[PDB]
């Protein structure tokens, strides 16, 4: 995350971190339930083997609430391709269930029609992660969050060197140097409605990080609510 702020205690409890052979974070996830993690399909191609860590806020400090879980099942969207980055969504079923506690709790899945009319119509959403603090920078050892404005689809398409499908949305800023970045992919974009946070996006891709005239591109979770439900069955 470029700009934004450190996530305060208890404030980002649905954050998960995919950790490669080496215990190094390369992508985020969102806790959906005791057994299921939401992430981006493209993350699956960036490490041969990985596990999921929950409850972590500082990768260099053992707080005591962290837990590492193995993945039992990977459910990748069958239509994802690297060529398009379209359908950039995957669900992970864990071998052993998460115990919800301090800094470990799921984000809510919204109902589609209401999500479209009430959540996606809000001014801003919230993105979070352990990724780079500027484009060519190092990843953050501390979990960060950022408020990111929703961006008009027409503006999104015009700004982009790549096709923006209906499975994608833009968020962030035109020139202001705040964005998600490398290492944040797969993690949560959530939108608050009366003190409850609903999953609205999956950190997907961007042409660099926080570049002038480019936006953060996110997987449009409203397009995949039924798909998520089936994957969690």
């Amino acid at each position: 995350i470029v700009g934004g702020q450190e996530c305060k205690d208890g404030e980002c409890p649905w954050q998960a971190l995919l950790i490669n052979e080496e215990n190094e974070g390369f992508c985020g996830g969102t806790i959906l339930s005791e057994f299921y993690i939401l992430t981006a399909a493209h993350c699956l191609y960036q490490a041969k083997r990985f596990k999921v860590r929950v409850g972590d806020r500082n990768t260099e400090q053992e707080e005591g609430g962290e837990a590492v879980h193995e993945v039992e099942v990977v459910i990748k969207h069958n239509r994802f391709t690297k060529e398009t980055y379209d359908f950039d969504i995957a669900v992970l079923r864990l071998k052993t269930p998460i115990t919800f506690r301090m800094n470990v709790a799921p984000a809510c899945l919204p109902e589609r029609d209401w999500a479209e009319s009430t959540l996606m119509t809000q001014k801003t959403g919230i993105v979070s992660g352990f990724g780079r603090t500027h484009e060519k920078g190092r990843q953050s050892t501390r979990l960060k969050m950022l408020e990111v404005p929703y961006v008009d689809r027409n503006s999104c398409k015009l700004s982009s060197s790549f096709i923006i499908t209906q499975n994608m949305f833009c968020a962030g800023y035109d020139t202001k140097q705040e964005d998600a970045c490398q290492g944040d992919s797969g993690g949560p974009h959530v939108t608050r409605f009366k003190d409850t946070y609903f999953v609205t996006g999956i950190v997907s891709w961007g042409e660099g990080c926080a570049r002038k005239g480019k936006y953060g591109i996110y997987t449009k979770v409203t397009a995949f609510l039924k798909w998520i439900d089936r994957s969690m069955k």
Binding site: C108, D113, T196
Partner: protein, 54 residues
Amino acid sequence: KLCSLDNGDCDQFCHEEQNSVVCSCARGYTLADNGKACIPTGPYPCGKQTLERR
């Protein structure tokens, strides 16, 4: 009478159904007797920050 004004007074989901407003809630909440509020059924309902120590 409409979801477009203060979310039909619903805490969470709102729908105009059989031409009338109906509230509902995410898994882990039960819709209150008043037909508006969402009451968490457990200590770690989805979408809530973990702000207090239990």
